[PDB]
Write a protein that binds this ligand. Structure first.
Ligand SMILES: Nc1nc2c(ncn2[C@@H]2O[C@H](COP(=O)(O)OP(=O)(O)NP(=O)(O)O)[C@@H](O)[C@H]2O)c(=O)[nH]1
Ligand SMILES: [Mg+2]
Length: 164
């Protein structure tokens, strides 16, 4: 069985870095902005039974927003990513969550992920503030993570998988 997941969120928050870290163990300090949504795969075991993630890594720039439904229409899950160092990205994440609730399948499982936890002092979003959004929106899970340090990336995907 397979998990069809879409990555959404403001450009620069680290959608491609998370999905490449998870699927390929690849991180780039100079990851290029995504033009057309990229497809990425990986198989992971659940509690014995095998599982294939099929991930659509969307371009986050607002000019590519109208393309996002092509990638979210058949999705089982969405990871809506923000950057813990940039307060504005959390409000962008809230807009995506609302858009998904209005336009996507009501069974869609949404996980909120605050990325770049490794950037210490530059944090602008508290754990408390990110989770307040996830609780207010009754999302499936809330994690802070670091694609760069590979911290909590595996755990976000495993958690999401168990909720599908
Ligand atoms: N310090 C730090 N930098 C990160 C982390 N994840 C991503 N980055 C950096 O942030 C920049 C943008 O990352 P990227 O994955 O391209 O973001 P995106 O959300 O895919 N952008 P777009 O929507 O335009 O494709 C890159 O320079 C990348 O190295 C992280 O966990 N920590
Ligand atoms: Mg990208």
């Amino acid at each position: 069985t397979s998990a069809k997941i879409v990555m959404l969120g403001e450009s620069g928050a680290g959608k491609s870095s998370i999905a490449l870290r998870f699927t390929r163990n690849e991180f780039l300090a100079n990851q290029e902005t995504t033009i057309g949504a990229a497809f990425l795969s990986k198989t992971v075991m659940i509690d014995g039974r095998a599982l294939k993630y099929e991930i659509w890594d969307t371009a986050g720039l607002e000019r590519f927003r109208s393309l996002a439904p092509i990638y979210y229409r058949g999705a089982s899950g969405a990871l809506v990513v923000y950057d813990i160092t940039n307060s504005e990205s959390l409000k962008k994440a809230q807009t995506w969550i609302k858009e998904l609730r209005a336009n996507a399948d009501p069974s869609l499982i949404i996980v909120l992920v605050g990325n770049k936890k490794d950037l210490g002092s530059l944090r602008q979003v508290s754990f408390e503030d990110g989770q307040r959004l996830a609780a207010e929106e009754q999302l499936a899970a809330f994690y802070e993570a670091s694609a760069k340090d590979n911290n909590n990336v595996e755990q976000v995907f495993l958690d999401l998988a168990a909720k599908l």
